[PDB]
Amino acid sequence: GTGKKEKNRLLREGRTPGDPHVKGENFYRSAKKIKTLNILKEGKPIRDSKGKIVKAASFQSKEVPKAVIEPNRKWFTNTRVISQDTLQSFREAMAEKQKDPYTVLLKSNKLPMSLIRDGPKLEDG
Amino acid sequence: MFKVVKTGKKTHKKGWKRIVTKPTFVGPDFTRRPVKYERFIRPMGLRYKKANVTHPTLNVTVQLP
Amino acid sequence: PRNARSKRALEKRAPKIVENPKTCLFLRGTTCSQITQDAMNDLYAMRQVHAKRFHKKNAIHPFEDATSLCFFSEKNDCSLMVFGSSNKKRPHTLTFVRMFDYKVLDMLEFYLDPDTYRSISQFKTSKIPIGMRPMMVFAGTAFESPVPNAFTMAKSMLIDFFRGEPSDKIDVEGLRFVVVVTADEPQKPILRLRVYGIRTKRSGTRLPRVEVEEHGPRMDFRLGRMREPDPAMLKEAMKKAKTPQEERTKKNISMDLLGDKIGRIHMGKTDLSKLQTRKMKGLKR
Amino acid sequence: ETKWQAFARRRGIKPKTREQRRNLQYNPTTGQWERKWGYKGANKRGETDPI
Amino acid sequence: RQFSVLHKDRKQISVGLIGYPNVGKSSIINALRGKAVAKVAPIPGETKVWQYVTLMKRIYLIDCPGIVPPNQHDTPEDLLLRGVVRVENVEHPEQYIPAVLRKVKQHHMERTYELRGWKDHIEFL
RNA sequence: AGACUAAUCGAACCAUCUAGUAGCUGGUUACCGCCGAAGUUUCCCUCAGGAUAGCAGUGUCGACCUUCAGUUUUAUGAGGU
RNA sequence: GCGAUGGCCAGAAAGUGGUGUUGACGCAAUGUGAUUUCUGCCCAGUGCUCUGAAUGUCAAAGUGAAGAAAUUCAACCAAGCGCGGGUAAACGGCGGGAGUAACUAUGACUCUCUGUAGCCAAAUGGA
RNA sequence: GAAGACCCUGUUGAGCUUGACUCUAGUUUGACAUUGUGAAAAGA
RNA sequence: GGUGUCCUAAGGGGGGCUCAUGGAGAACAGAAAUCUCCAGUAGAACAAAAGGGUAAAAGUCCCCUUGAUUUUGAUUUUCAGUGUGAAUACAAACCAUGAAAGUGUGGCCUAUCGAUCCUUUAGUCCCUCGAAAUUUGAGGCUAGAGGUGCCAGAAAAGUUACCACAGGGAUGGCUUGUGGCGGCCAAGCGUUCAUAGCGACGUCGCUUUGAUCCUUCGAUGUCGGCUCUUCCUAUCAU
Numbered sequence A: 001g002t003g004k005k006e007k008n009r010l011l012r013e014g015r016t017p018g019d020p021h022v023k024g025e026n027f028y029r030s031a032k033k034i035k036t037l038n039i040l041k042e043g044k045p046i047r048d049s050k051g052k053i054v055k056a057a058s059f060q061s062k063e064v065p066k067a068v069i070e071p072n073r074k075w076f077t078n079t080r081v082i083s084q085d086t087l088q089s090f091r092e093a094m095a096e097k098q099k100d101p102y103t104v105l106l107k108s109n110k111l112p113m114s115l116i117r118d119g120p121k122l123e124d125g
Numbered sequence B: 001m002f003k004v005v006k007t008g009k010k011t012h013k014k015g016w017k018r019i020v021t022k023p024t025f026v027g028p029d030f031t032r033r034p035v036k037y038e039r040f041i042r043p044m045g046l047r048y049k050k051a052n053v054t055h056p057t058l059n060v061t062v063q064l065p
Numbered sequence C: 001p002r003n004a005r006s007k008r009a010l011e012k013r014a015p016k017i018v019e020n021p022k023t024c025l026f027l028r029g030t031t032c033s034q035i036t037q038d039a040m041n042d043l044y045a046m047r048q049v050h051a052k053r054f055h056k057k058n059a060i061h062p063f064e065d066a067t068s069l070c071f072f073s074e075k076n077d078c079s080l081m082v083f084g085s086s087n088k089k090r091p092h093t094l095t096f097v098r099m100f101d102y103k104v105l106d107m108l109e110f111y112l113d114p115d116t117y118r119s120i121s122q123f124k125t126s127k128i129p130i131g132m133r134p135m136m137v138f139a140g141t142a143f144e145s146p147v148p149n150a151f152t153m154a155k156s157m158l159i160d161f162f163r164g165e166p167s168d169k170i171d172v173e174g175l176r177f178v179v180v181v182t183a184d185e186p187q188k189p190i191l192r193l194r195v196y197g198i199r200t201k202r203s204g205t206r207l208p209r210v211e212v213e214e215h216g217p218r219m220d221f222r223l224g225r226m227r228e229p230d231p232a233m234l235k236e237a238m239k240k241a242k243t244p245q246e247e248r249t250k251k252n253i254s255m256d257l258l259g260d261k262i263g264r265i266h267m268g269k270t271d272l273s274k275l276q277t278r279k280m281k282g283l284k285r
Numbered sequence D: 001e002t003k004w005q006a007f008a009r010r011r012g013i014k015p016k017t018r019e020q021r022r023n024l025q026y027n028p029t030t031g032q033w034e035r036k037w038g039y040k041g042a043n044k045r046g047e048t049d050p051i
Numbered sequence E: 001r002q003f004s005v006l007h008k009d010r011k012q013i014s015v016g017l018i019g020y021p022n023v024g025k026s027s028i029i030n031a032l033r034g035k036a037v038a039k040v041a042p043i044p045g046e047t048k049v050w051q052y053v054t055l056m057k058r059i060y061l062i063d064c065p066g067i068v069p070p071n072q073h074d075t076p077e078d079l080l081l082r083g084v085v086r087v088e089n090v091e092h093p094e095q096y097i098p099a100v101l102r103k104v105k106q107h108h109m110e111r112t113y114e115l116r117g118w119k120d121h122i123e124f125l
Numbered sequence F: 001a002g003a004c005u006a007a008u009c010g011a012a013c014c015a016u017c018u019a020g021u022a023g024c025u026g027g028u029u030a031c032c033g034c035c036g037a038a039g040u041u042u043c044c045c046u047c048a049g050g051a052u053a054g055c056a057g058u059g060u061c062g063a064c065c066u067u068c069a070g071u072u073u074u075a076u077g078a079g080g081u
Numbered sequence G: 001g002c003g004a005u006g007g008c009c010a011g012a013a014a015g016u017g018g019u020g021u022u023g024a025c026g027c028a029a030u031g032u033g034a035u036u037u038c039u040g041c042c043c044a045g046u047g048c049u050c051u052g053a054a055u056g057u058c059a060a061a062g063u064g065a066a067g068a069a070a071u072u073c074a075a076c077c078a079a080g081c082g083c084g085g086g087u088a089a090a091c092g093g094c095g096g097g098a099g100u101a102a103c104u105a106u107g108a109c110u111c112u113c114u115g116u117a118g119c120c121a122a123a124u125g126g127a
Numbered sequence H: 001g002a003a004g005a006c007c008c009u010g011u012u013g014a015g016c017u018u019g020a021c022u023c024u025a026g027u028u029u030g031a032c033a034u035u036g037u038g039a040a041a042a043g044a
Numbered sequence I: 001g002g003u004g005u006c007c008u009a010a011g012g013g014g015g016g017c018u019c020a021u022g023g024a025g026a027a028c029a030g031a032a033a034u035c036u037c038c039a040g041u042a043g044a045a046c047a048a049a050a051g052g053g054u055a056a057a058a059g060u061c062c063c064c065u066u067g068a069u070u071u072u073g074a075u076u077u078u079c080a081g082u083g084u085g086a087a088u089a090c091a092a093a094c095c096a097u098g099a100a101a102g103u104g105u106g107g108c109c110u111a112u113c114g115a116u117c118c119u120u121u122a123g124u125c126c127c128u129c130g131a132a133a134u135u136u137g138a139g140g141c142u143a144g145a146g147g148u149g150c151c152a153g154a155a156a157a158g159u160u161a162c163c164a165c166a167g168g169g170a171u172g173g174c175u176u177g178u179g180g181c182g183g184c185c186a187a188g189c190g191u192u193c194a195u196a197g198c199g200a201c202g203u204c205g206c207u208u209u210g211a212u213c214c215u216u217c218g219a220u221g222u223c224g225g226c227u228c229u230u231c232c233u234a235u236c237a238u
């Protein structure tokens, strides 16, 4: 055959020479799978001989960032707008909607439901 | 921001799970990740949906989603 | 394209999913009659907005070499040409050239009858506004051939010439002019091009009574030489692109009237006939 | 596909987000917002300083 | 499988089983899996904590302890006949026998215990 | 059961290589006299990093010659406040 | 899996030993683990095995040419691999059912799917 | 027998696994020698 | 291409104007400085590589924006063990400008590492191959050329709850009874060449006709029980 070494496997699979690799790659492990399985091993800090942490664990950095918001014109505009025709079409759909047990909801539409659903009843109001 | 959630039955624990200690917003149609792959834990008792928002011009405070 | 204006020009000339309206280049050979020039002027008047016009004499014979036409199309971004010429054999000729990717897709000669040609100025009527699309009527049995022929290609080129800018909506006041092309199968058949203006009258019903009045020009053609497309080039040219606003339909996935994504599940028939119930002690005699 | 695009596809390198790739950064020492490049960018820092 | 194909964007789907104690949740998980992967007992409260079982590559099953939603109109007799409690830990068990005799047909009891001729539940017992 | 194999078992016991190696732990033996310290200074991929400046002691030698100085004053800068 | 010029072993080796005073109702290795119950549906991606055509990769030995020779260059080139077939279909994947214009793999493009104790099975319908 | 158990550090030791690295027992393929004596062809 | 300088960036929109050159004139000024008129199809400028680019402009000066890469999308393509989806395409909205018709923007790209490195060429009159000579070859030394498409290369993983050894370890005169954010009022503090700024007491906005009972929202942090004594008071009883 060709060989069970990693050079032989990469040449057989036609990988690009000189590409970097993640430590622990083999036939059974890709880079994504190695990252997934190294997540389970993460969480332990690096310490010196006296137990003082010299490198913090993942997402335990202790470094205090600069929490600053830049000035931007986008903060003062309308993100979502809707027209009266679109609202009226949605109101007609709201009135027309029925319930089917054999259909399921997969992704809700972000809509201004307070302007679309009907008002409370007279006696309740 | 994150505290360490420890797992395992041995005296030495694994420490990869991080719990968010501040209020969060998870959005609509939210289903939590399975526990074997849930690194970040946003607890249900800290999730918010509404806020008391003030309009500086109109001088009105309304509870908005 | 270092300059932003040249970058804009290149982006206009770039291939697109939804293509721009086609531009027609009107040009003439070294010898071209006054009748042929008048016919080219009338066609340019019917298509002013999406046409460019040359004004020199070009030593080009389209059915021998079309490298110059390819160069002119590449330089002017004109995917149609109307080319005028004249010989002793062919006294008044309009050559319609349609191209694909700056290479000649197909060509067709029209021979213009000089004794029956009337210009737009020879009718004292109200004319078509600039940029307004006329409706089109193609009449007669010459355009329904099972095999592609000169009349099918002529119909395709005339539709591509008069189609204008496509739109999803039209004002009802923009339905006032019609271009009618009539041709019958058979000695050589005559393709007749006429343009009319449309007036509407009361009829006692909801629909109006349409009456027509001639607008011009009045052209009579005999179909001449023909250059058919390469089949592979024609397949590439007749591929149609799907816009992003055309959703690729997924199985059991829909959008309802409120915009929610909805999935369909299928339970199947409930068949409990093969179920044996538990043979309890209390159910035995 | 270019050399970078092939390399990123092989190595699982994800494209940077538009917020991540902005020409803006906060300088702590001066306490101002500054561009990373371009006219008066941070890549040319100190070319106009007095000392 | 249909639900998994509908949620093919995710890595998998999770199916959680809920209901009353002893309605058969763990048994349903075992029946789907083809193997005794969850503990099954006729006593209520056999399952005390949630359990993941990998049914297929993209389908998870989540076993849950049984729940009784509190109702002001439900009686201890109703709960005991629904199977909420262990009957070894109740006081005065014969006070629930008349409910069982109302629920079960008389000839079914007679052929079950090969016994006939009682006039009340005390004499039956 | 990694169980048992002479109280010795995730590899028995005996002698030798062997005074094996340790940067880690412990220890390291009279007196008086004269001096006497130090912690990013500058460069190098970091931690399981290095040199290096600086600060000291003994000798000498050279005309131990030139004088210099963590100071003030004078002139002129900065601070015109 | 093995019909003896064999399999499974052991040994540094042997004119070496064992199984073997053995021969498929046997021997050796696996998994499961009395009885009763029991085999969701369909394949064909990994794998299992096919001397089926290839030289495509193709060592040593051997062959030819050039050079004064060291040497260099050429074909030739086994198994395995590769290519192309059938599966223990084990692992694995696997919402169905219809059509067609593709025409073989992969299709692809539309359609639409929700008995207060019985019947049927060789007494029983069970874990 | 707490100089235990636990945590932390090592130029740490050792057992164990796998297309981690370099080797290798075994196995398979080819060539050379053991290897001799006559034919019938096909090429030089 | 190498150095040293300068800029409220480029772009977009709108408006006004007309260029290179020639002729005739104007102190210094004289082929060549600036000014005036006439003639000037672009023979200038700017883009591209016309065989017909552009003239009340696509050139050049003023005005306005400069906000340095917007928002939304059940849609397109790719991706996502960090799935409020990201990137991308398209569309819409917004935005800039203009009286307006309109016009236009909301980026361009790219693996990395050596240069004391890698590859390669020449030396005829360079040296040596140590018994001698010649021809190949090799080494040394010197001088060149190119720069990761054609300049080679850049794949030494885990686990130990069966274990072992050498070592090192195991906020505080804090707290308590009365929410946060936003606005207003306000005695007073300040200020009175500026009339700003602080401000208790308050107040106002957000956070079921005695109902409903068909909405219980995550163990990293661990408590106990027995026996028995004493203290505190922040008092349940007397």
Ligand SMILES: Nc1nc2c(ncn2[C@@H]2O[C@H](COP(=O)(O)OP(=O)(O)OP(=O)(O)O)[C@@H](O)[C@H]2O)c(=O)[nH]1
Binding pocket: C278, E020, E021, E022, E023, E024, E025, E026, E027, E028, E039, E040, E041, E042, E043, E044, E045, E046, E047, E048, E064, E065, E066
């Ligand atoms: N006859 C019959 N019995 C069933 C069936 N399914 C479950 N059972 C029995 O019902 C009892 C309850 O089964 P479980 O699987 O423990 O049900 P559960 O609701 O999970 O009980 P918890 O663990 O307390 O939550 C078991 O003894 C089963 O044998 C069934 O389909 N038919």
Ligand SMILES: [Mg+2]
Binding pocket: E021, E022, E040, E041, E042, E043, E044, E045, E046, E047
């Ligand atoms: Mg149970």
Ligand SMILES: [Mg+2]
Binding pocket: E025, E026, E027, E039, E040, E046, E047
């Ligand atoms: Mg259960």
